[PDB]
Amino acid sequence: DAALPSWMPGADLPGYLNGTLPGDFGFDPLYLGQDPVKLKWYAQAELMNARFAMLAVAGILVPELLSNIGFSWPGAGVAWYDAGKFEYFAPASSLFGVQMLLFAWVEIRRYQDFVKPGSANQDPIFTNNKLPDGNEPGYPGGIFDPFGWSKGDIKSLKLKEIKNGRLAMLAFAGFIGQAYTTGTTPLKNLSTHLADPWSTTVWQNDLARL
């Protein structure tokens, strides 16, 4: 509600969005972050869902692109939605069991910081090890920023993080929809479009499926 960037040039934006969070373009048509305590939780949520979505999309597209090329390895042409039934060294169940244990420790360590900032910046075992005092929930830094990037224009870097994440979160949503609708991998869906974009729009595809 000032002169900060807007999702719709000329609109009256919500005052609660004041440009303190990265990517504050005043977009809250349903007035969800109007309450400050909800907005505080939603900021971390958006950052967490974005950071996993960014890793996911990378780990979904890179292997497919390598598969198209001559790159050889166990996965090869394994479709992301078919990776679960793939046979690995250990039973899925076992792996999941380990994953939930390992994550219980890290999530509750991250959650402790969020509820009390700077309360989990110390190594439980090697007490001497720790994270620099200056810390905000969602931005642990220290050994999580091993190259010092945070030191430079941190605000621009945080905006690049939120922007790339929102696109990744939308990409994953695409992968889910396009996979269930076109029943094929994303880079295959892109090849179909690049071959004949005009005749390969969701409109025509869904019309044919009707």
Binding site: M8, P9, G10, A11, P197, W198, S199, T201, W203, Q204, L207
Partner: protein, 229 residues
């Protein structure tokens, strides 16, 4: 001030400020200020669209006589399929229409190029973007604002003529003028239709009822055929 009916008193709301104000508002549709502000833009948009369509339909008939404008949608064939063409049109018009609309809702809030910060339209009026959209002005702008509305009101009435002529004669604008010029006494609508207390006679629709296009069958109805004279 010239009026639509010489010797008449114009509506109180129609003073003479707007271009094309000949004191014509019999139903009082423009007595509300905020409503007049919308209808003024609507008249301009309708005028410019109609002027281009009447120009295009006449030129298309000269350059492409074999193709009847009414049958162009089904006849025109391009490698960009109907859907591909429509998608592109939908996105491009959504952007331009929203940008123009926001100008009406908040004047001066959409004069800046969203990609290049160095380019912004100078302060202007709704309906008259100017700036890059007006590279040359051959004469007084006020006079051309009258020429634009007058040429637009005529074009808007011409298109409606092209449509009804197409449904009553099955021919493009020029082909009709020629039919009329061949036999004016037997080509007017009066010489094509007649209703008297005893009976009713109306020209038949000359437009097929449905068109077959890419295995869809598009409904193609005549306009208020039941109420046709």
């Amino acid at each position: 001030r010239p009026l639509w009916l010489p010797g008449s008193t114009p509506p109180a709301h129609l003073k003479g400020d707007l271009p094309g104000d000949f004191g014509f508002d019999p139903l009082g549709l423009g007595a509300n200020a905020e409503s007049l502000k919308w209808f003024k833009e609507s008249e301009l948009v309708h005028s410019r669209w109609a002027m281009a369509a009447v120009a295009g339909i006449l030129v298309q008939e000269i350059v492409r006589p074999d193709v009847f404008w009414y049958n162009a949608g089904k006849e025109v064939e391009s490698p960009l399929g109907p859907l591909g063409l429509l998608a592109v049109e939908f996105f491009l018009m959504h952007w331009v229409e929203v940008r123009r609309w926001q100008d009406l809702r908040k004047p001066g809030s959409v004069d800046q190029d969203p990609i290049f910060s160095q380019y912004k339209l100078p302060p202007h009026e709704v309906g008259y973007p100017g700036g890059v959209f007006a590279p040359f002005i051959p004469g007084d702008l006020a006079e051309l604002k009258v020429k634009e509305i007058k040429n637009g009101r005529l074009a808007m009435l011409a298109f409606v003529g092209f449509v009804m002529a197409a449904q009553v004669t099955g021919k493009g604008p020029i082909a009709a003028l020629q039919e009329h010029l061949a036999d004016p006494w037997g080509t007017t609508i009066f010489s094509k239709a007649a209703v008297v207390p005893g009976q009713a006679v109306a020209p038949p629709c000359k437009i097929p009822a449905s068109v077959s296009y890419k295995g869809i069958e598009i409904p193609t109805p005549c306009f208020l055929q039941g109420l046709w004279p």
